[PDB]
Amino acid sequence: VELPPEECDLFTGEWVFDNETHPLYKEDQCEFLTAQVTCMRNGRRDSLYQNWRWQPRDCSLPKFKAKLLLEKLRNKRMMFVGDSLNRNQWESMVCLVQSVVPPGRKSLNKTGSLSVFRVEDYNATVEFYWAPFLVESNSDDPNMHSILNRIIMPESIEKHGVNWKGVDFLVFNTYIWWMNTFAMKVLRGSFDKGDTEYEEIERPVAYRRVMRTWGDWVERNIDPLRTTVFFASMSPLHIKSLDWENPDGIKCALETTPILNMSMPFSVGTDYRLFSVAENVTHSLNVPVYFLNITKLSEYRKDAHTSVHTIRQGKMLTPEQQADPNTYADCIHWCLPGLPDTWNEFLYTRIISR
Numbered sequence: 001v002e003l004p005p006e007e008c009d010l011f012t013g014e015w016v017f018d019n020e021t022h023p024l025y026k027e028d029q030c031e032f033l034t035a036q037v038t039c040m041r042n043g044r045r046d047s048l049y050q051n052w053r054w055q056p057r058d059c060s061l062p063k064f065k066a067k068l069l070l071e072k073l074r075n076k077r078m079m080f081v082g083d084s085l086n087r088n089q090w091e092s093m094v095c096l097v098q099s100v101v102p103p104g105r106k107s108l109n110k111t112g113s114l115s116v117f118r119v120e121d122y123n124a125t126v127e128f129y130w131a132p133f134l135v136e137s138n139s140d141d142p143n144m145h146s147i148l149n150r151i152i153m154p155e156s157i158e159k160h161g162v163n164w165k166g167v168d169f170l171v172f173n174t175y176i177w178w179m180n181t182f183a184m185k186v187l188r189g190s191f192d193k194g195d196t197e198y199e200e201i202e203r204p205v206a207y208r209r210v211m212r213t214w215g216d217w218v219e220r221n222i223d224p225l226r227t228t229v230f231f232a233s234m235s236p237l238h239i240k241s242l243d244w245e246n247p248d249g250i251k252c253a254l255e256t257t258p259i260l261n262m263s264m265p266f267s268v269g270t271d272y273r274l275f276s277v278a279e280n281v282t283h284s285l286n287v288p289v290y291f292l293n294i295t296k297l298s299e300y301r302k303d304a305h306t307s308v309h310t311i312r313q314g315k316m317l318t319p320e321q322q323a324d325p326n327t328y329a330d331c332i333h334w335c336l337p338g339l340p341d342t343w344n345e346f347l348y349t350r351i352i353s354r
C-alpha cells in the first residue's frame with residue numbers, strides 16, 4: 001500500500017475509468033444495502049457509473065484494503081453524524097468494511113436515531129447518527145414523515161453531543177435540508193419548553209450560527225489524540241439537465257457517464273456560501289478537522305444518482321413510476337456501489353495515514 005504525501009491535495013484531480021478496480025464491491029455482495037440505494041436490483045441496467053475512480057492531481061489514492069482499515073478500527077467506533085447523504089456515506093462504509101468479514105461476525109442494530117454496524121472479530125463499529133441540521137431541530141427523528149416547516153435551534157447541541165462523546169472517528173455533515181427554502185426557520189426559545197415562535201434567518205447566517213455551536217462543542221469535548229474529526233462538504237444535486245448543457249435530458253435520469261470536459265464551466269446549484277462557512281469554521285478550530293472537500297468532484301457525477309431506481313414511502317417505484325423520471329427521479333441520493341465509496345476512500349486514506 002502506497003500512502004500519499006501529507007501535502008497532496010486529494011480533492012483536486014479527475015475521474016478515471018477503471019473497471020479493474022472499481023467498484024470496490026458489487027451490490028449483491030452487500031446484504032446490508034437498503035432498498036433506497038440498490039439501483040441495479042431496482043431496475044437500472046447500465047453499470048458504467050460503478051467503474052469510475054477519482055485520481056488526485058499529484059498522487060494516487062492508496063489501494064483500499066478493508067483489513068487495514070479494520071485494524072485501525074480495532075476496539076474503536078466510527079460515527080457518521082448528519083443527514084440522509086451522510087447515511088448514504090455510512091451505508092457505503094459498511095459495504096467497504098463488511099467485504100472481508102465472514103457471515104455471522106457482523107450485525108446491524110438501529111435504535112432510535114443511532115444505527116450501529118458491528119464487526120465482531122475487531123470489536124469495531126461503523127455508525128450513523130441522525131442529526132440533519134447537527135443542532136437540535138424539529139426534524140431529529142429519522143422515522144418521522146415529511147413536514148413542510150423545519151425549524152432549528154442554532155445554539156443547542158448538547159443533547160445530540162452526548163451521543164458523540166468517546167467516538168474515535170467522527171464524520172459530520174449537513175446540507176440538503178438547508179436548501180428547501182430561501183431562509184431558515186430559527187426558534188426563539190426551546191422545543192422542550194413548548195416554545196413555537198420562530199423567525200426567518202438568512203441561510204448562510206443561520207449556517208454560520210450552527211457551525212459555531214458545533215465547533216465550540218468540538219473544541220470542548222474532543223481530545224485530538226483519541227478522536228479524529230472529519231467534515232464532509234456539500235453533496236450536490238443534479239435536478240436540471242440544462243445545467244450541464246444537456247437541455248434535452250430529464251433531470252439526472254438520462255445520464256450514464258460523468259461530466260468529462262474539464263473546460264466546460266458549469267453549476268448544478270450548490271450553495272457555495274455554505275461551503276465557505278464550513279471550510280472556514282473547520283480550519284479555524286483548535287481541534288484539527290479534516291475537511292472532506294467532495295463537492296466539485298461530486299458535481300461531475302451526473303450519472304451516479306439513484307434516479308427512479310429507488311423507493312418511495314417505503315416501496316420500489318413501479319414500472320409506471322420509473323417511466324416518468326421528470327416526476328419521480330431522485331437526483332439527490334447515490335447508488336451503492338458508486339460515488340460515496342470515493343468519499344470513503346478519502347476517509348480510509350486519512351485513517352491509514354496516521
Ligand SMILES: *[C@@H]1O[C@H](CO)[C@@H](O[C@@H]2O[C@H](CO)[C@@H](O)[C@H](O)[C@H]2NC(C)=O)[C@H](O)[C@H]1NC(C)=O
Nearest residue numbers: 009010011012013279291293294295296297298
Ligand atoms: C476543493 O476541491 C476543488 C477541486 O475539486 C478545488 O478547486 C481546484 O483548486 C485547484 C488549486 O488547488 C485549481 O487549480 C483548480 O482549478 C480547482 N478546480 C476546480 C475544478 O475548481 C478547491 O480549491 C478545493 N477547496 C478547498 C478549500 O480545499
Ligand SMILES: *[C@@H]1O[C@H](CO)[C@@H](O)[C@H](O)[C@H]1NC(C)=O
Nearest residue numbers: 017018019020021022048051
Ligand atoms: C472493462 O471495460 C472495457 C472498455 O469499456 C471493456 O472492453 C472490458 O470488457 C471491461 N472489463 C474487463 C475485460 O474486465
Ligand SMILES: *[C@@H]1O[C@H](CO)[C@@H](O)[C@H](O)[C@H]1NC(C)=O
Nearest residue numbers: 074075076077123124166168
Ligand atoms: C470494544 O470497543 C469499545 C469501543 O471503543 C471499547 O470501549 C471497549 O472497551 C472494547 N472492548 C474490549 C473488551 O476491548
Ligand SMILES: *[C@@H]1O[C@H](CO)[C@@H](O)[C@H](O)[C@H]1NC(C)=O
Nearest residue numbers: 107108109110111112114116
Ligand atoms: C440493539 O441495541 C439495543 C440497545 O438499545 C438493545 O436493547 C437490543 O437488544 C439490540 N437489538 C438487537 C436485535 O440486538
Ligand SMILES: *[C@@H]1O[C@H](CO)[C@@H](O)[C@H](O)[C@H]1NC(C)=O
Nearest residue numbers: 245260261262263264265266
Ligand atoms: C469543452 O467545453 C468547452 C466550453 O464549453 C467547449 O469549447 C469545447 O468544445 C468542449 N470540448 C469538448 C466537448 O470536447
Ligand SMILES: *[C@@H]1O[C@H](CO)[C@@H](O)[C@H](O)[C@H]1NC(C)=O
Nearest residue numbers: 272275276277279280281284
Ligand atoms: C471565509 O470564506 C471566504 C471564502 O471561502 C474568504 O474569502 C473569507 O476571507 C473567509 N473569512 C474568514 C473569517 O475566514
Ligand SMILES: [Ca+2]
Nearest residue numbers: 001002003062
Ligand atoms: Ca510499497
Ligand SMILES: [Co+2]
Nearest residue numbers: 013014016055
Ligand atoms: Co490526465
Ligand SMILES: [Co+2]
Nearest residue numbers: 075076077166
Ligand atoms: Co472507547
